[PDB]
């Protein structure tokens, strides 16, 4: 029965009176749907932050309310998958009907499991992006921050990472804090189109929703992910974005009367984000035996990576991916700045062939940038520096990749192997030809049955096996030799070209066949 009464409504906070035994985040029910959470309480009064609104309720002074006596727990329903829900569990857009029996109830502020329940990260998470999968690896249970400027493609990177899980067992969860509704609907449509809707949930808190909802949305999403992980499933969580979450917490704290701190954020914003993000990782079989991979997103101002919130988040996550506005302005998508990005798991979060294919390429790229930014007196360049410059320029041409394009893990491994062995350096003068040859190789490996056989034998027999060496020598290398001879004739006499392409036949019928196939839908006279 109702046992509280509203006495004041100030600063978007509700003051209730009535003897009770309040607790932190205790649910106060104002109607059958509208609920709030207790923030502070005397023995006869409480301060409450509302979670949702109703048109007909007309919540004002004197309205009756009930202290349920329980904490803020989110309920789990079978029809969460393929739907957009708010922080209380209401289907804003749903794909299937709901049975009104809750599978579980998960506490929003559930404490992270202790040290002995964890396990080392040893399985990759394929993001579908070549440079991320090869040089900036992301494992299952690893927290990789996506830091960047405004409008540089961070949401696209997260969406690509989740769309890459179309043919896997990983459940995607997308938490949106203060986003646009017409963008959430568009992401829902993208999920429906690529057939990942049945394994994806969206948790939405709009930019004009209640501040408590925007503050508590990531925790509710993490509770859902923990429910899924307790039955031993891999969960990939994308929080977009923690700048809005920090803003919501700052707004709530400043309206509640808390004193400000550095950049006007409250003094415990780091604790907020760290206790939020420490609930993801890899767990041993005795404690669920799953994983929760998190990809938080954060925005910088004018490329200032030394901001308070970006550096607070960098100290929590296991590396970061930085997207450059200068690169994005040049039409380079994804605009990932590899020199400013890092993955702290490293080769321990890769397959053996992928680890071997890209063993020391990131360091080579950093050295290439250092030499490019260096001014010296002797205009003579040593052979080692020439090799570094050529390999860095060749590496720069593997980053480019179209939007929503998922590249297989083995294709990325093969491309990185080709780069590492030195076959792509000869394109240091022509980059469009390099792009064409990379596109042809990707098409061959994706469509032809021999390309899929090559990828399969790469997975099961490894790089060092004789069969894969034969496949590389008879399928891929001849095409590269033919293309290099075609585009650059003088390479027929180059010493290194002769040294590498010695026992390789000049076969280029694959490229010509694909060109014919593409041009076969060609017309002599255009209509437009």
């Amino acid at each position: 029965m109702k046992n509280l009464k509203i006495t004041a409504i100030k600063d978007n906070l509700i003051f209730v009176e009535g003897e009770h035994q309040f607790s932190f985040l205790e649910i106060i029910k104002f109607s059958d749907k509208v609920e709030g959470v207790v923030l502070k309480a005397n023995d006869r009064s409480a301060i409450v932050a509302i979670l949702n609104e109703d048109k007909d309720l007309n919540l004002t002074v004197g309205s009756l309310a009930e202290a349920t006596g329980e904490l803020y727990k989110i309920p789990i329903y079978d029809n969460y998958l393929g739907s957009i829900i708010n922080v209380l569990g209401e289907s804003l857009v749903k794909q299937y009907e709901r049975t009104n029996v809750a599978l579980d109830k998960k506490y929003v502020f559930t404490e992270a499991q202790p040290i002995f329940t964890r396990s080392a990260v040893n399985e990759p998470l394929v993001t579908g992006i070549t440079v991320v999968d090869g040089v900036l690896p992301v494992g299952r249970g690893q927290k990789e921050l996506i830091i960047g400027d405004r409008g540089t493609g961070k949401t696209a990177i997260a969406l690509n990472a989740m769309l890459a899980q179309e043919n896997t067992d990983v459940i995607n969860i997308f938490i949106a804090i203060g986003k646009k509704r017409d963008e959430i609907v568009e992401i829902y449509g993208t999920f429906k189109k690529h057939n990942i809707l049945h394994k994806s949930i969206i948790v939405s808190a709009a930019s004009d929703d209640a501040v408590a909802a925007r503050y508590l949305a990531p925790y509710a999403g993490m509770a859902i992910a923990e429910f899924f992980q307790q039955i031993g499933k891999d969960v990939l969580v994308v929080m977009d974005d923690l700048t809005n979450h920090a803003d919501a917490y700052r707004e709530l704290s400043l309206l509640a009367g808390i004193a400000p701190a550095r950049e006007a954020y409250p003094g415990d914003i780091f604790y907020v984000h760290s206790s939020l993000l420490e609930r993801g990782g890899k767990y041993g079989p005795e404690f669920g035996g799953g994983s929760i991979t998190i990809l938080p997103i954060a925005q910088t101002l004018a490329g200032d990576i030394s901001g308070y919130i970006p550096t607070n988040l960098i100290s929590i996550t296991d590396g970061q991916i930085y997207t450059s506005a200068k690169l994005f302005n040049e039409g380079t998508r994804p605009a990932i700045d590899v020199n400013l990005s890092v993955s702290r798991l490293g080769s321990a979060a890769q397959s053996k062939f992928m680890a071997f294919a890209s063993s020391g390429l990131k360091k080579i790229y950093t050295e290439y940038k250092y030499l490019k930014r260096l001014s010296s007196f002797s205009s003579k360049i040593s052979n080692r520096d020439l090799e570094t410059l050529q390999k860095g320029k060749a590496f720069e041409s593997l980053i480019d990749q179209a939007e929503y394009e998922v590249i297989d893990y083995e294709t990325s491994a093969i491309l990185f192997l080709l780069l590492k062995k030195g076959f792509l350096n000869f394109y240091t003068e022509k980059t469009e030809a390099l792009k064409v040859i990379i596109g042809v190789i990707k098409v061959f490996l994706a469509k032809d049955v021999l390309g899929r056989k090559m990828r399969a034998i790469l997975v099961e027999h490894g790089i060092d096996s004789i069969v894969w060496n034969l496949y590389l020598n008879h399928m891929i290398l001849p095409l590269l030799k033919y293309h290099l001879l075609s585009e650059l004739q003088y390479l027929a006499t180059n010493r290194e070209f002769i040294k590498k392409f010695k026992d390789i036949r000049n076969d280029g019928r694959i490229l010509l066949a694909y060109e014919r196939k593409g041009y076969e839908r060609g017309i002599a006279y255009d209509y437009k």
């Binding site: 839908r521 017309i523 002599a524 006279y525 255009d526 209509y527 437009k528």
Partner: protein, 143 residues
């Protein structure tokens, strides 16, 4: 004028496709092909669908038409109207200075003027393709 330009572009695409030995099927009744007797000597023909020896590399008209809905609708309407006109007994012009007739039963023939055969032979000997059709404003039929 737009429709006329589009129709001329379609017939020129058919012309360019048939000089390379690729028959074009506009309908189950009329199939555009070419007969070459020697180098420098080719002649366009219209034939019915053979019964026991399928033609070598036949392509639909849809292949040589832009994917835009308006262009496809215009070309589809032109093909349908051409079929109806041939069925009722008209004599329709398909290439420049040629004529398409349907004789008794379902036998179609293409009659080529002197200059049309001249342009065919020029295309096959010297690769002098006809220039792309352009938007021409309608001219007053009288005076």
């Amino acid at each position: 004028a737009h429709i006329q330009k589009i129709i001329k572009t379609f017939v020129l695409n058919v012309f360019a496709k048939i000089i390379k030995g690729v028959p074009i099927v506009l309908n189950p009744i009329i199939i555009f092909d070419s007969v070459r007797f020697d180098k420098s000597k080719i002649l366009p023909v219209a034939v019915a669908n053979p019964k026991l020896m399928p033609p070598l590399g036949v392509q639909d008209w849809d292949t040589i038409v832009d994917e835009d809905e308006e262009i496809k609708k215009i070309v589809s309407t032109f093909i349908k109207l051409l079929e109806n006109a041939l069925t009722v007994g008209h004599e329709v012009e398909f290439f420049q200075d040629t004529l398409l007739v349907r004789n008794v039963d379902g036998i179609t023939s293409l009659y080529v003027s002197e200059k049309a055969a001249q342009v065919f032979n020029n295309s096959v000997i010297d690769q002098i393709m006809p220039e792309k059709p352009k938007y021409e404003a309608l001219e007053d039929p009288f005076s």
